[PDB]
Amino acid sequence: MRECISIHVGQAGVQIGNACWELYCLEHGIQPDGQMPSDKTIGGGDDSFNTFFSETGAGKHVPRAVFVDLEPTVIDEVRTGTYRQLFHPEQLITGKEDAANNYARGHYTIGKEIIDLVLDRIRKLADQCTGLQGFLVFHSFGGGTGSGFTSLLMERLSVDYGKKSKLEFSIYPAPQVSTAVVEPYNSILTTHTTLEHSDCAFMVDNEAIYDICRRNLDIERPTYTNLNRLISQIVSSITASLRFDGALNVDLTEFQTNLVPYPRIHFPLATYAPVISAEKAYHEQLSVAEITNACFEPANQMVKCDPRHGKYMACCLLYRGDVVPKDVNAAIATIKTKRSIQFVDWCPTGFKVGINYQPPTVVPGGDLAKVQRAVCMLSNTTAIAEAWARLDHKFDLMYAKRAFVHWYVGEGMEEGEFSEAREDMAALEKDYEEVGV
Amino acid sequence: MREIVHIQAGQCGNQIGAKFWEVISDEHGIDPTGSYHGDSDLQLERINVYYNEATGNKYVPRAILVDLEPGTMDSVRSGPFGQIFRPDNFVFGQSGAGNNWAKGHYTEGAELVDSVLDVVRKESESCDCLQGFQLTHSLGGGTGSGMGTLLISKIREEYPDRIMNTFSVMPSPKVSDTVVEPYNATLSVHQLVENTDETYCIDNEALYDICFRTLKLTTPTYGDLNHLVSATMSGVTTCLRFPGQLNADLRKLAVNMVPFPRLHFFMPGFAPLTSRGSQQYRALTVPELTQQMFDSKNMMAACDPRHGRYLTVAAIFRGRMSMKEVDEQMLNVQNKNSSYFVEWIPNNVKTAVCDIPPRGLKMSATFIGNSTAIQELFKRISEQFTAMFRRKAFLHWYTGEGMDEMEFTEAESNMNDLVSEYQQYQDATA
Amino acid sequence: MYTFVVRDENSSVYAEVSRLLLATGQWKRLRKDNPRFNLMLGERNRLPFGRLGHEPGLVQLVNYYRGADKLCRKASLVKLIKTSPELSESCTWFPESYVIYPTDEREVFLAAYNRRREGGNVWIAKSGILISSEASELLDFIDEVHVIQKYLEKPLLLEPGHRKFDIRSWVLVDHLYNIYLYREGVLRTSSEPYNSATCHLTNHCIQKEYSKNYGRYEEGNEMFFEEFNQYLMDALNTTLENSILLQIKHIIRSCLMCIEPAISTKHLHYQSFQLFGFDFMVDEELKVWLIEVNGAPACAQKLYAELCQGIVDVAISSVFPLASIFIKLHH
Amino acid sequence: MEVIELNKCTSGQSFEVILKPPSDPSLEEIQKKLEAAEERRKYQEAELLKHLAE
Ligand SMILES: Nc1nc2c(ncn2[C@@H]2O[C@H](COP(=O)(O)OP(=O)(O)OP(=O)(O)O)[C@@H](O)[C@H]2O)c(=O)[nH]1
Ligand SMILES: Nc1ncnc2c1ncn2[C@@H]1O[C@H](COP(=O)(O)OP(=O)(O)CP(=O)(O)O)[C@@H](O)[C@H]1O
Ligand SMILES: Nc1nc2c(ncn2[C@@H]2O[C@H](COP(=O)(O)OP(=O)(O)O)[C@@H](O)[C@H]2O)c(=O)[nH]1
Ligand SMILES: [Ca+2]
Ligand SMILES: [Mg+2]
């Protein structure tokens, strides 16, 4: 057994973290108390769920997680919330004033003053690990903390834990819920600085999950609560293999091995189905063939793009519920004849499949309905570069006039870093086009 | 617990300043004695932003009242919410400034400014995490204009890393007190361009025209003018005073509203426009709020927004309403008039919604715009300024206090530069 | 009020559509880089499809199908027909074709070419074109990416004149992937007698430049369907509908239904329509062949007004309702 | 449609199916950058307090 430490940064990272750990506790049968009746080995364990939970002599199960934010309001809700007994204070780290949606302020100014504290609190979790395998970092592109402080942290983690893997769960900015005009700046900036330090990053466009909530959950105006509950299901599907008995994606190293042939091209597109409203009285449960086919509809992707006009480098199908291999292969066979699925010449056209017999757990009183089977497809497709292109365009528009640039320079950053980061994104778009066209 | 320190200087500053505290104290359920008697936890969740807590759970405005004559401040102390203010925070002289910027900035105000900074310092030391300062004043007088910009320059010296916000009232010959107001305003703008992060341009020309044309008040008083300002000030500080995602603090607001440091002069708006005691009974539909908030007739600065382009916009809706409908209607404004929003700042309109409405209304909307049309305001003051200055009229009032003509020349130049900088981005294309 | 943008100034077709839209009074043209548009008359190359359908509160439509180039490029069309089981190697309305690279199917072309000589072996190389029976000559012409296609040695010849021609058909595919064939087609005719040994290429540009006889038989070497149908009734005792159009309507459907899964915008975040230009040759036996597909076709002068109005009615007004000239090729 | 590496357990099972075959910066360097940015801030503030002093 090898431990995994989760790091939640900024408002998005923390609030998403809350949804995930709430969901992890339901899936593993852990109470807000922190007690886990099913766990008969008291005080310690070598089990799969111990990857995410440590144990105390009293039998409390404690998330190997650290919450960080340069402003205490959000984390204060965790300290006073339902799962307050779950974490111990040293895990929850808070500053006084935030990064004001400024990458430079989060990276250079305020980051410099708290980076040594966070690393020391992380170091204390690492010292309780017999074989720490790496980190799962949750954050936003748009926030000053989520973007600026994360990139600083990722730089230092590569220094202090050079051998360990690092996975990202990034929230990509969407105008319908964005709180800043400069979120395109922060995104390119944090992507540029973090790129070489991240092994596999799962982007989640707020736009996509926003529309999924409107379309399928029949929610008129989704809140962060609605968004995070759905995101947590995706994260849970992705991290389930680390927390349950299986033979596919059982360590962080295998994520890179299975999904990332080229290091810079480490942004797998996630697709999830079925998303059913808990308010629908009558619902016909969907078959393996129906949910698998849904994984190739852009309307169900975490990022709205068109894989038909790109190429695949890898594909993983993660099922949860009543599923057997025979029905998967039968569904894949049918789909391959009907859909446009082209891999790169230097990759096998195939699918790595994982089935967990336990159906998806849903938060009591949530928006999602209980389903007998669901699937999350992880596909490294070049079509996700459409997200970078949208982002880089917004960047170019503002930066041509140097709009808002003075806020960054004022915090000590140099204007050269803007172009340096944009150049790196230009090269990245170029890499995608070479591989996929 | 991000505290804001409020300062009000001069007659105008303390009049509007007093009304501001009357309005928000009512919204937060604070009575004239400083005791809370509200019915919602939303009222106290961010009360510490503008109020200090004392024993007996008394709430005291973090406000500092400044003037060079005791007149208006004696009226405030005898006003309805006079007792609420900290008695030691009343700081005043006796001489007055005689509507002379030079008196407020260089002579009379210099004698008093240290006493004010001693009160500011005591307030700031008590802050858990000071955001910065908001100043209410007019630019046409002497104290609020002259000493106000002096205070600003001194506060920046001691607190260079804090945000400096101002509610600055602009002078209009329609409400003129003296002929030297264009001199005082131009000299003040010269200071504001340099030493403020955010300035709400409240124009007396606009306030008067609203009272006359729209509210059908044949003979507008200052009370009628301040009903509109206090409503605007309550609106644009909503995001700061209640739980919210957008523009929740002074710095995040600046980052979203100010693409270039000098261009930080905002054009505030409000809907529905009401007169005191009108007490209208029909709430506006979300579509009605949206069309009116963006209407020229609802702008507190006498500038035609269609004569320029919006760099950034911040809309705040107050009351119980469909957030879905707000989003649809806000998207509708941008898509129907996309030519008036610059294309080189994508998604430059941010919207907030607060469940608590202002008193007397079920539904209200406040508008904050950084438009290039604001140059019309500075052009106006510049014309009036140059008309006198070409003949050096009335300058003796200023040279008698030690000022030189060059300082007027520099101030005029910098304001004309500001006008030309707005015009530059009004013509810029992507 | 609906809004649109124009990013292809060299488009005669959509310049008329743009004018027609403005004439409704219910459409306003924005600057080209204004993202808040309902309709995009995009550019011919590197159209940013990745930036479409990401504008809250806007239904966005574009006048091109992403991936339609697979049908509109010479080499891509060949590869499409050969490797697509819906069309297959055994396709009877597309001439024998091969893809060749200068300095690939060279080995395969020669393998079949040697078959031809022992014991008609004329071909055509398309990127400037070169028709020749000598394979060694064609391969040289390429070197100094092309397609080598079987040249139709026995074309249908129009009398009087003994001259060849090709048929242009305008097809409109809307957002629902309804295939619409325009009523009016055109015959780009050669004004020169067809010589078995300027007269071989029916290109309007080449005709105007190298032909002495340009415009004697018909206006600008363009015969329309009413006349061509009449000729077919008098000379061969048949109709345009039966002898030719059935085959045309078949080919258009087969090609577009083949590529539909790859380019359909049914469940996408943005919608697409597009105007296509199918070019056909017909031989002595009144058998129809497909030459190429044009992704950005112009129109015949007298047909601009009617066709462009049809694009607005069918492709645009269908998505954006205001306040038939087409034959629907049913699937 | 070749199935390979089929693994089974009480919790579930996993496998692979192939349709077709193929055809850095030091801690020192970080500390410098943060400090280089801090000095640029201190310089800008120094110019401000100099301007205000005038
Ligand atoms: N999906 C989702 N997105 C969120 C959530 N909270 C914030 N965001 C997004 O994150 C972006 C802003 O970053 P934040 O995380 O809020 O800011 P931060 O990391 O705390 O940085 P600072 O506030 O500047 O210190 C916006 O585009 C939001 O849409 C959330 O709970 N769920
Ligand atoms: N395989 C073939 N058999 C017989 N004639 C052919 C032929 N391929 C081309 N032609 C003749 O040569 C002409 C070349 O036109 P092609 O369409 O091949 O190039 P183009 O794409 O530059 C012209 P357009 O786009 O206007 O149709 C055709 O119109 C036809 O008259
Ligand atoms: N809106 C409003 N404007 C005022 C009020 N009192 C004065 N003014 C304006 O302020 C300017 C004069 O400034 P004043 O406040 O009297 O100067 P000071 O007290 O010496 O600083 C004139 O242009 C007036 O129009 C008021 O109560 N309300
Ligand atoms: Ca145990
Ligand atoms: Mg924050």
Ligand SMILES: [Mg+2]
């Ligand atoms: Mg006065």
Ligand SMILES: [Mg+2]
């Ligand atoms: Mg062509």
